[PDB]
């Protein structure tokens, strides 16, 4: 039950490994704001 493609494509656009992302759930429960925060954090 991987996340929807509409969300994964975004990750690819900016370049972010969805797997590493850990918002609410790094699984079929990955949100759009999940990855948004990934990179936003910066470092």
Swiss-Prot record:
List, for all copies, the residue spans of the domain called Peripheral subunit-binding (PSBD): 2-39
Q: Which domain of life is it from?
A: Bacteria
Family from the record: Belongs to the 2-oxoacid dehydrogenase family.
**Subunit arrangement?**
Forms a 60-polypeptide structural core with icosahedral symmetry.
* Function of the molecule: The pyruvate dehydrogenase complex catalyzes the overall conversion of pyruvate to acetyl-CoA and CO(2). It contains multiple copies of three enzymatic components: pyruvate dehydrogenase (E1), dihydrolipoamide acetyltransferase (E2) and lipoamide dehydrogenase (E3).
The name of this protein is Dihydrolipoyllysine-residue acetyltransferase component of pyruvate dehydrogenase complex
